[PDB]
Design a protein around this nucleic acid. Sequence first.
DNA 1: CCGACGGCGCATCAGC
DNA 2: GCTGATGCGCA
DNA 3: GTCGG
Length: 322
Amino acid sequence: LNGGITDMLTELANFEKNVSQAIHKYNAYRKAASVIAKYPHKIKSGAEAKKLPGVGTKIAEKIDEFLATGKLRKLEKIRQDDTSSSINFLTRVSGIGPSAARKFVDEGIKTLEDLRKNEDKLNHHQRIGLKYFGDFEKRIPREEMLQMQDIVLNEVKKVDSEYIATVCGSFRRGAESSGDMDVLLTHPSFTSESQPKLLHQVVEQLQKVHFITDTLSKGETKFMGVCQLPSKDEKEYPHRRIDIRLIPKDQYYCGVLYFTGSDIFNKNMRAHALEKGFTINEYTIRPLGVTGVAGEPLPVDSEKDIFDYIQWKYREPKDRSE
DNA sequence: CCGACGGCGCATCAGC
DNA sequence: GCTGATGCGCA
DNA sequence: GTCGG
Ligand SMILES: [Mn+2]
Ligand SMILES: [Mn+2]
Ligand code: NA
Ligand code: NA
């Protein structure tokens, strides 16, 4: 339908984030691309698009120019600018953000080949992103996600049967592919009110069976690293990004709910929670008073509990597109 | 006309 | 060595 | 850049 337009808006988004370092305009363009992508008609003018929430005056003007000419002047200028195109490109490596990409380009480091020649100028995270540049841009098919889930759940329970692990993200909504693997971890001994190395023991075991191959960051509640499925002669599996988050048990199911999404679903759930006198964040659900003052967090034993408080019928994850 | 727009865990740095 | 700021990635 | 207050 309008792929030409949504591509243009995505490019602009990427330029605003990576080159202009203007994060709010980045999100404005993404939001416009999202709503347009869902519009069930071929857009004929800026005016028509302007009717959509998130599309404003300036975007409507760009849509008119693109419809008239098949291009944006602004974008063509950005494309044949060497500095902008290289800065934008370098941010594709994990650990290189707008600030580093700009620093590198300023000193004439503009390609993966230039990065490889200057590994001495990269921090640890950046060296890993460079090393697995191609693998990290590959999506993960559902069948491998399930194989990964199996290994994680298994090795987790092998450390302590009391651990609870949940793989969240679009995967839990039954997506046929995932960008990375996001695991939420909890344990009885870990509560809001009060063990020292709970997460470490899980990372250790997954390293032990050679599932986890590299670490980007690690602390007491959050691990970000790299993993790989095992191979038997045949093709080695691509390395994948995995995060593991250790969450206190009394906030675990609020966590699962949050990190399951989708983002659109969370928005309309918070929105309905409010109309019913409740406020839901990533951590707790809490009741509101007449002046809008949140009380103590309510006890939560499962996602359903949360749907009960706000008198909402339980939505199975697969129906949480919104 | 105006400021909001997600907020946080971890790595690294800047200033001292 | 200390602390707080910044960069980064990610629901 | 777009929005609601
Ligand atoms: Mn303003
Ligand atoms: Mn307005
Ligand atoms: Na609009
Ligand atoms: Na990056």
